[model samples]
Target chain A: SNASAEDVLNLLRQAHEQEVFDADTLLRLEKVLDFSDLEVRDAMITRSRMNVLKENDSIERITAYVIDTAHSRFPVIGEDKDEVLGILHAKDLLKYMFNPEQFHLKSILRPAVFVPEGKSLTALLKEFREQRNHMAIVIDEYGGTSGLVTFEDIIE
Target chain B: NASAEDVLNLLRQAHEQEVFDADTLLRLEKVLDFSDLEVRDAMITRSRMNVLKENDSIERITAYVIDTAHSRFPVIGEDKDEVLGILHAKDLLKYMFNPEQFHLKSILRPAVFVPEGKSLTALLKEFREQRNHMAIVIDEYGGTSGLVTFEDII
Candidate 1:
């Protein structure tokens, strides 16, 4: 029988049947393979589900917001939601520990990365790893933000 | 369209006819086929596992648990492969609150074992019927290959 690397799935099944890689790992690979066929829009948290913070919100207030939502990251927007500004990571709040009252949002906010809704998930994952950015703002063709995508949302 | 498979196939045809968006069709297709997966493929590997030894001190176990976000862990006997039972973080927390009332052996729930190659569909059914969230994976040689949780199948 002629065999090559393309037969990985078939070989994977045979190994699984023999109890080699274990079932969950095999299934994860299957999903990872499917990732190439998906896009950021397919798994994005729609604008309705996205938790956004106003650009000038108090640092202390944002901390409480993060705690209430139990979210590690949030989109920091300007006067309007579509007027995207930057991203806020909860860990970045460590800078405010010394003097929370004088903390500024602009000082710690990371610039938001815009991605089209139709962007492929496989490419997005590569960008995520290389750029080390876990969150992406998904924008429609008209340039308005449609939703947001997180690394956890894609992998799940 | 009686079953999800039939409906899925129908959706594919709809996609061919341009009645549905490719994005919607692809997501639906992936979700439908996901159930066909096996537990062995999706489980967390043994090497990456966070386990608690039966003999670990209560303080040590509590600190280990509080340091991580995971709510559940496998309880091992002598080694990594010698899984004795499963532990819930809340159980350890409750144990810490009542040291005299707590016992390591009493806190651990006997682990359910499922073979490495078992289908996730079957595993899900087993999980639902037994009301269990996790199962230890067993290799053919009777070694603990890894473990699967309800979240893994979903």
Candidate 2:
């Protein structure tokens, strides 16, 4: 018998009696703890990686864009400008499409939200809650659209 | 107008123009937009919160202090929102050194109060200038509420 084995056997027997673990599970339980500072941009989708719409495009074009990505929201820009003008919801388009006259695109365009690229995820979650907002265009120092974030994206 | 592409650019522009204003004391409404900001938002929620139940032992209290990173705690006979007084870590340390003399209620500091809906930028400045790290958020009821620390802003 291994010397001092009785104590180890007793502890294992106690744990086993509780049915907390099997032998293989116990062997794989060893691990180290590690945590990280979750930064904003770390969670943000980059600008080049963004999904958006050009204002001049027709409903047909925007509809295709929304379908290709299956995204719920898009930022609308005018005259090929990269800066965001407003946030558009795919659902809004769905309702608007029914009344193309009322959809006027501009009528249903929601006031857009924006945020810094360097903020933290924890803080961003709060921002999404307070703004009564879900979609926001992310910005960089030079003031160009860097990316976009949404409540659903953040939470899930 | 770059289509409101992102809000920070507007805020940055506002900051540059020195035009940004909360208009009055920041309210929960204003605190909504800049959710990514630190300490100020996380410090306290809507309630006066420093209340804790009495069955808290030294180890349990220690765990709460570490989780919250609070230097002082409001000791409540029952609930933290119903705090009887404050507890300072220094007092806890002193008690640790002299176990026989440790009284759970001794060494509690008076609670510092701040109205709910204070902004992080303003609170950060206040926490810096006041040289005080801890405070309690209060409601109209004048009850003990949530706690905030200077580090929470940091």
TM-score, chain B, model 2, is 0.55
Q: A1-156 in candidate 2: lDDT tens per residue?
A: 222223333443444466544443222111000001344576677777777788777766676667678666788887543668898766555343224444478877887877888765656666776775677778887888788877655543
Write the residue-wise lDDT of candidate 2 on B53-81 in tens digits.
Answer: 45566556655654564445667664555
Writing each residue's lDDT as its tens digit, candidate 1 over B115-152 gives 98898867866776687878988899889888898766
Candidate 1: Cα lDDT at B97: 24
For each candidate, report its DockQ versus the true two-chain complex: 0.04, 0.01
Q: Please give, for residues A1-156, the per-residue lDDT of candidate 1 as tens digits.
A: 333223545644665586544576466545544565688889899886789999887765777777677677789989877887999876566444435667888988999999999998877876786697789999999999899998766655
Measured with C-alpha atoms, the lDDT of residue B1 in candidate 2 is 26
Indicate the residue-level lDDT of B111 in model 1: 85
**Cα miss at B72, model 2 (Å)?**
45
Model 2 / residue B90 / CA error / Å: 58
Best by TM-score: 1
